[PDB]
Design a protein around this nucleic acid. Structure first.
Ligand SMILES: [Mg+2]
Ligand SMILES: [Mg+2]
Ligand SMILES: [Mg+2]
Lengths: 171, 206, 234, 30, 16, 137, 405, 208
RNA sequence: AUACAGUGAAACUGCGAAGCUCAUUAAAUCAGUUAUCGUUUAUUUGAUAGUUACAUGGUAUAACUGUGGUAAUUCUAGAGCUAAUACAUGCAAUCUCGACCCUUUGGAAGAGAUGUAUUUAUUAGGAUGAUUCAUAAUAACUUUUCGAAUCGCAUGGCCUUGUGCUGGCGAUGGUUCAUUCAAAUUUCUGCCCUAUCAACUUUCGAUGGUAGGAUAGUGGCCUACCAUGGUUUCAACGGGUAACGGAGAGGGAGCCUGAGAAACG
């Protein structure tokens, strides 16, 4: 029933167009995939051509990258905290791109301790105070940079700097 | 109802029409996959164990496993395409025209048409390892000498036919593998040579 | 679609319209459909070697025809501009070039001329593993090109090895052949390249008779320097 | 604002008109 | 704007 | 700059807080070409605009038009008006016609009602916008 | 008491179901697979099931799906899927107006209400704001829809017009329920208060502020249900407590908690089965049957996977539960009542079934809650029992402790 | 081995302890098929703590579920982690199982990633347990005679087989150092002296 | 032809299945044209992958044998076989810096380096007017892809006589890129009368921005928030038309295959 055709819309002038033809399969849309935290469950979709799309119907773990330290670790997702588009998505714990989620800090903490030999040379180990506080809490704010409804992945990056300050203000 | 009893060890199968209702009643209310004692099914069947495997009703509709009813229902089956077809339940009842049974165990007395007779296998092994397993051949022994042959007599002409072995090791397969490896190596050599030639061309340009 | 009406067939084939209900449909290949000559047309309606399609099929299945040094058995193989067609049984080599009328002309050539062709450098780019390559007009991807080769240049390809023997830069005073527009088939020398960024660049071409004409860059094919074409012209 | 149904429109909707008929008996209690 | 497209009719003879 | 629910940033442009090499945030920009000068306010500006021809992910290609700005009141887009004379052969006379084109305008340009603007075509930005304001005058 | 799982996932929560099926084909030789009994063919959604309901006729069932968002209608007589109908968006809730499956109203998550008829989607309408619940009055022919906004939107099916929406004092309505005998209606606000409205007039009869002397933390009214008698009312608090109220009084007769700390989703009064004083309360984790008057746990239904909703066939012992797993679990409790007519011989095969089994009776404390409650001393003693991350505790003792702390 | 698992009471066999120890070695075998048979016989021994985590150990052996089981079962502060009281009994089984996976050659990307996963779970372990894993890698190597004498290599020990066992051990240590880094536990017996003795053998073979 | 070898029913695999009848619509159809730096593309054409094995399993059945039910179908159940390009599994090398400057092509101690595919993060950046484009690298991720367990013809070159080593011409396969065949959107232009058709659009998006969902992708195509806009007396909008001068296969609704279909299945 979903279609991406522009014929149903009113013209630029505002005239009401008539149905030129029945809906075609080369202008189809598919139902949205409301990804939610839980046991991983991905549904394959056969698209135009031989290409396939992965529907992250449920997902709980993802590869998040620490940009400042230039590393990446696989971490569990605790829950959605803030989503810029719609707040009901935050209410229902829906995962999509640009969503701000809370992730476990255990792997990043272990890596930092191993690499710098310092509980969380001294100058290099220094990091932003808010990020230090988030590690002290035990969970980190991250922004998902992937599209779970398309690629079946929920990778992302830990917020830092002005980005983190802005989203803390919004929270 | 008729009872189609099969002995799979021998490969035999035979039908027995039962007229009295008592055998039919002791069969009632069971399920496909359950087992019954032949002694109830008859003195001739004394000591036998019969596993119910299926059957057909007076209207010809078969029984299906997994459906739990005494009556017929229209179920959505597949011969991806699925069609709605009538099938009778897995609960044996008085509406069954024929009930199929498999002899799990043999009783004291021998059935005339099932235990006493045998039916040989139709075909023999065709893959090499299958033949080795069948004859327990050692690795050094060649399967070529152990291939089963069937004799065919057309009129006065007579000859032996044997299956074409598959997955067998032959010189041709080794030649193909060697050719593939040599082709890959040659392609790599050509690529390296072209890269070197480009390198000296750039060296001359510089 | 899979059927072509003769009236809908390309003009440049020189086919007579009333010969039949249908014309051959050039299969996919190096050259575009509207810019190709299927082998059946070349063998039957131009060279008159075969009298019908079945005769052409017999000839091809005999493996007597080579295109760019490779045997082709497809009746509708789309041979095109600057494609070398060899008939070894008769010992002939032909090169396809448009006429001033705009139609393909069957030009016989020597063996040495047949040994090589020219390709217009449509693209120069680096492939995987950092290996530079050039894509020509006939769909040939040639690896490890000379660095000086750039787009709109012309590379002399050896058919046997498929390697660039030499190259010609695109510059004023160079001898060019028109492969599009109303000037299709004309030969001249470049005078100036008028440059419109984000638009079709324009080249002015002067003939030996001093007459000048303007054509889009995409339709230009450098074939040599003035007075020294690298191929035998008809 | 009115577009996308964000504001409530109280005009009659023909397809759902007379979809169901009320029960005249009423609630069991008086 | 300019088309720069070949036209068969112009080159084809119309003497008849 | 951050007057929206989401944070505005140039995608894949990373400012490493740890290094702190420079005070100014790293800014990516490109010259749209056709010999057209990219303004310095775009080079040294702070706005974020995905549809800006010099800083956004939009490339100018195709037709280049000129027109008179008639409206500028929508956010980052304007309505220009191109006037022409349509020829009627039967009366052998011209009649005044005009066509109104909506065009995206980057914040790097300041456009009023009446000035002449040169615009360039790009990929479809919105329902009716297929161009981008690129020179004001 | 004994609980028999007729169908569902027999594997543990950690084991993924889809690989198990790919291992299931490998072990198809194992005899138990051939002898399995499936009550209803294709009783499994593609990924998960959101809601399940049984038609009042008693011969049909309906369910909603995840991907592609689709509606499954099952026929008990044929023990199979009558049809599947896809949708444009996932279903938040729905109801079956007719006694049969013919007429049903569906509330999608895209802010749109869809009316489904025999042939197909009869009509679709959009409400002003996102919805969370749905209910319909037979007497008034008025469909009552909660939403994120404070208003509780009112649609009249007889006149086919939206009407004046009831204005809740609080913002948001998590759940709405209507009592058949009374007509009284309740709404579950995000704050710990239930606002009762009258449908005869357009008024707020009163509001009840849920009081939790045990836990002082905030919570929301997630579910509300009215008993058939009409003088009893049940609530579901997000903290994980379900309250039973007699509407005449203003105090909770009994407060029973599941203990895991998850929200209450569905509350069902098992009046029809016999021994009317039994109630069901359903978390994501577990669903428990306990006595109405005394609050003693009768039996427990714990699936491996989360529960999205539970439904009970009237007059019978079976319970259908919508779960996150590919199959939809269904449980039979022979003690409560006889099996339904359609699956008559399910009673004959009770021995073959799984016969799955303490969690329902006792409360569960998190490690942080243990430290706050000053129960670190209880740790390592018989009183406190460890269950994985947190430790179980007696219900009465926990109530006394939270009063202390 | 399959017969050993089917024994009704493996604990009361003639030599249970010596058998049981060898079953640990088989649990450390590279071939996952051997490990499953070894684990079943180990499960035939009745041990409540091992019984509690029977599914997780089986999932570890299964290749398809190996990755997810590591993330859920072994991660520190995750729910499904082993309880502290049960660490002592279970971790010896865990180390032997993971060692077998480390033994698996990295001939394709999947085994290369599987090798990385096996070494990446070490930080979740406590420091004594990490040292135990390193001890297992060096148990096969024979170095005590070298340090026992005045640092002389035996000609018999100088073989291609020993060098390969050297190469496996060194590769394990190099990966472990990269993961643990400054946190790595260094002990003379477990790591340092097997490491040094490998260097001496390399010099011995290269010169000789 | 003592594995088979010619021909070959049946069956499993592989490829391809993409005229009529009604309605009608003013540059929304259509013709010409631009762009795809905004996309998918079976096939053709050119390039392109050194990272138990003298060949694994039924985790396998059809065709086939045999026993039956039914009034009965391109209706059927029970029992027993057997194969693959079907289904699963899977395996002692090269290149740099190069001391010694030993010999001055040269050898060479030592030190190094070494797939592809998806997603995210980061670092560098020959082609085009223009790019975050091409390409390379680092850290990880993946229901981690692929990297010949295939077939025909021929039987050459060597020797270390073992059927030891090494091989010629094709077919069928396979990753990526380009080309071709196409498809989808898209820029601009294009002869009726019309005001006795002056307002139309937000009429469940009308005009634009941010973010997200979906698509093969751009995009109000759809959704949340925000601004109140857009067309028009230079004729918007509406009406009439010798605008034959777009729809469906008993009627509406839903779904499935493929490179291409909302399929005359
Ligand atoms: Mg009859
Ligand atoms: Mg190819
Ligand atoms: Mg967007």
């Amino acid at each position: 029933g979903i279609s991406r055709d522009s014929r149903h819309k009113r013209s630029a002038t505002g005239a009401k167009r008539a149905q030129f033809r029945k809906k075609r399969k080369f202008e189809l849309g598919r139902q949205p995939a409301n990804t939610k935290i839980g046991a991983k469950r991905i549904h394959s979709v056969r698209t135009r051509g031989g290409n396939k799309k992965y529907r992250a119907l449920r997902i709980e773990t993802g590869n998040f990258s620490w940009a400042s330290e230039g590393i990446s670790k696989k971490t569990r997702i605790a829950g959605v905290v803030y989503h810029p588009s719609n707040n009901e998505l935050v209410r229902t714990n829906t995962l999509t791109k640009a969503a701000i989620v809370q992730i476990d800090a255990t792997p990043f903490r272990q890596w930092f301790e191993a690499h710098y030999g310092q509980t969380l040379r001294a100058a290099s180990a220094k990091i932003e105070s808010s990020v230090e506080s988030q590690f002290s809490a035990g969970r980190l704010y991250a922004c998902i940079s992937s599209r779970p409804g398309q690629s079946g992945r929920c990778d992302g990056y830990i917020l830092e700097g002005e980005e983190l300050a802005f989203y803390l203000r919004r929270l | 109802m008729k009872l189609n009893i099969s002995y799979p060890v021998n490969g035999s199968q035979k039908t027995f029409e039962i007229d009295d209702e008592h055998r039919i009643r002791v069969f009632f209310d069971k399920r496909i996959g359950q087992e019954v004692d032949g002694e109830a099914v008859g003195d001739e069947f004394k000591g036998y164990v019969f596993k119910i495997s299926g059957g057909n009703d007076k209207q010809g509709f078969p029984m299906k496993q997994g459906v739990l009813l005494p009556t017929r229902i229209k179920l959505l089956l597949t011969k991806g395409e699925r069609k709605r077809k009538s099938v009778r339940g897995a609960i044996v009842g008085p509406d069954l025209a024929v009930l199929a049974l498999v002899i799990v165990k043999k009783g004291e007395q021998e059935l005339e048409g099932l235990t006493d007779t045998t039916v040989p296998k139709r075909l023999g092994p065709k893959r090499a390892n299958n033949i080795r397993k069948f004859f327990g051949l050692s690795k050094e022994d060649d399967v070529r000498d152990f291939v089963i042959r069937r004799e065919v007599t057309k009129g006065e002409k007579t000859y032996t036919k044997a299956p074409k072995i598959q997955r067998l090791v032959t010189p041709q397969r080794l030649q193909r593998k060697r050719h593939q490896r040599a082709l890959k190596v040659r392609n790599a050599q050509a690529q390296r040579e072209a890269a070197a030639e480009y390198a000296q061309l750039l060296a001359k340009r510089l | 679609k899979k059927h072509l009406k003769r009236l809908a067939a390309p003009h440049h084939w020189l086919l007579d319209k009333l010969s039949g209900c249908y014309a051959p449909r050039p299969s996919a290949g190096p050259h575009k459909l509207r810019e190709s000559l299927p082998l059946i047309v070349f063998l039957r309606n131009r060279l008159k070697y075969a009298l019908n399609g079945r005769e052409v099929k017999a000839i091809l299945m005999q493996r007597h025809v080579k295109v760019d040094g490779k045997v082709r058995t497809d009746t509708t193989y789309p041979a095109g501009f600057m494609d070398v067609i060899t008939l070894d049984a008769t010992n002939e080599n032909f090169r396809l070039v448009y006429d001033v009328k705009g139609r393909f002309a069957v030009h016989r050539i020597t063996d040495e001329e047949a040994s090589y062709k020219l390709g217009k450098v449509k693209k120069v780019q680096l492939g995987k593993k950092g290996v530079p390559y050039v894509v020509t007009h006939d769909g040939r991807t040639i690896r490890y090109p000379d660095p000086n080769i750039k787009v709109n240049d012309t590379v002399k390809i050896d058919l046997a090895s498929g390697k660039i023997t030499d190259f010609i830069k695109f510059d004023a005073g160079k001898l060019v052949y028109v492969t599009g527009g109303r000037n299709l088939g004309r030969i001249g020398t470049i005078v100036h390249k008028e440059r419109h960024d984000g638009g079709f660049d324009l080249v002015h071409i002067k003939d030996s008779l001093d007459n000048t004409f303007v054509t889009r860059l995409n339709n230009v094919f450098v074939i040599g320097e003035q007075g020294k074409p690298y191929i035998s012209l008809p | 604002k009115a577009s996308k149904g964000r504001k409530l429109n109280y005009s009659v909707q023909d397809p759902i008109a007379n979809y169901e008929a009320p029960i005249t008996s009423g609630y069991k209690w008086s | 704007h300019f088309e720069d497209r070949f036209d068969a009719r112009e080159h084809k003879d119309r003497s008849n | 700059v951050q007057s929206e629910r989401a944070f505005q940033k140039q995608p894949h442009i990373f400012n490493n807080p740890k290094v702190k090499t420079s005070k100014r945030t790293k800014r990516w920009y490109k010259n749209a070409g056709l010999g057209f000068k990219t303004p310095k306010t775009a080079i040294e500006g702070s706005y974020i605009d995905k549809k800006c021809p010099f800083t956004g992910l939009v490339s100018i290609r195709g037709k280049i038009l000129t027109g008179t700005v008639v409206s500028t009141k929508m956010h980052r887009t304007i309505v220009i008006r191109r006037a022409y004379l349509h020829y009627i052969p039967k009366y052998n006379r011209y009649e005044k016609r005009h066509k109104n084109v909506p065009v995206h305008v980057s914040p790097a340009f300041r456009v009023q009602v009446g000035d002449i603007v040169t615009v360039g075509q790009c990929r479809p930005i919105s329902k009716t916008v297929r161009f981008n304001v690129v020179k004001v005058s | 008491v004994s609980v028999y799982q007729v169908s569902g996932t027999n594997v543990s929560r950690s084991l993924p179901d889809w690989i198990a099926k790919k291992r299931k084909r490998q072990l198809k030789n194992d005899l138990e697979y051939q002898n399995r009994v499936e009550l209803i063919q294709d009783f499994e959604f593609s990924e998960a099931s959101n809601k399940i309901k049984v038609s009042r006729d008693g011969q049909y069932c309906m369910a909603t799906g995840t991907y592609k968002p689709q509606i499954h209608v099952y026929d008990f007589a044929n023990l199979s899927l009558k049809f599947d109908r896809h949708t444009d968006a996932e279903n938040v809730d729905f109801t079956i107006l007719s006694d049969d499956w013919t007429k049903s109203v569906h509330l999608q998550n895209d802010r749109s209400i869809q009316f489904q008829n025999k042939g197909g989607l009869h009509y679709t309408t959009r409400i002003p704001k996102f919805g969370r619940s749905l209910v319909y009055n037979k007497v008034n022919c008025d469909l009552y829809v909660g939403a994120s906004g404070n208003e509780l939107y009112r649609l009249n099916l007889e006149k086919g017009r939206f009407l004046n929406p009831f204005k809740l004092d609080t913002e948001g309505v998590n759940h709405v329920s209507i009592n058949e005998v009374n007509g009284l209606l309740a709404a579950g606000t995000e704050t710990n208060v239930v606002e009762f409205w009258d449908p005869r007039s357009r008024s707020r009869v009163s509001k009840l502020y849920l009081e939790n002397n045990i836990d002082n933390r905030p919570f929301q009214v997630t579910t509300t249900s009215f008993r058939n008698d009409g003088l009893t009312f049940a609530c579901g608090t997000s903290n994980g407590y379900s309250y039973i109220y007699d509407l005449r009084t203003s105090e909770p007769s009994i407060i029973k908690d599941q203990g895991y700390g998850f929200d209450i989703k569905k509350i069902i009064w098992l009046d029809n089965v016999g021994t009317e004083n039994k109630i069901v309360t359903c978390d994501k984790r577990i669903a428990k049957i306990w006595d109405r008057l005394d609050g003693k746990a009768y039996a427990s239904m714990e699936p491996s996977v989360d529960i999205n909703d539970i439904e009970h066939v009237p007059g019978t012992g079976m319970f259908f539960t919508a779960n996150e797993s590919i199959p939809m679990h269904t449980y039979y409790i022979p003690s409560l009542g006889p099996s339904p007519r359609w699956c008559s011989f399910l009673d004959s095969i009770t021995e073959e079934l799984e016969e799955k089994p303490v969690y329902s009776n006792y409360r569960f404390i998190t490690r942080d809650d243990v430290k706050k409650l000053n129960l670190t001393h209880l740790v390592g003693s018989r009183v406190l029992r460890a269950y994985m991350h947190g430790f179980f505790i007696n219900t009465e003792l926990y109530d006394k402790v939270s009063l202390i702390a | 081995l399959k017969t050993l698992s089917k024994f009704k009471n493996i604990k009361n066999v003639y030599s249970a302890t010596e058998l049981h120890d060898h079953l640990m070695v088989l649990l450390g075998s590279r071939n996952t098929d051997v490990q499953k048979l070894a684990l079943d016989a180990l499960l035939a021994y009745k041990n409540p703590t091992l019984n509690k985590y029977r599914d997780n150990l089986k999932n570890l052996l299964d290749d398809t579920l190996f990755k997810d089981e590591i993330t859920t079962f072994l991660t520190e502060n995750g729910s499904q982690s082993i309880k502290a009281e049960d660490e002592k009994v279970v971790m010896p089984y865990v180390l032997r199982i993971f060692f077998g996976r480390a033994q698996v050659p990295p001939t394709s990307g999947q085994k290369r990633s599987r090798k990385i996963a096996v070494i990446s779970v070490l930080p979740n372990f406590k420091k004594p347990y990490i040292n135990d894993f390193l001890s297992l890698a060096s148990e096969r190597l024979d170095y005590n005679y070298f340090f026992g004498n005045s640092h002389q290599i035996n000609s018999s020990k100088a073989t291609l087989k020993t060098i390969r066992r050297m190469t496996g051990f060194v590769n394990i240590v190099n990966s472990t150092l990269s993961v643990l880094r400054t946190n790595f536990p260094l002990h003379t017996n477990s790591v340092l002296q097997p490491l040094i003795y490998s260097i001496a053998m390399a010099y011995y073979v290269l010169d000789t």
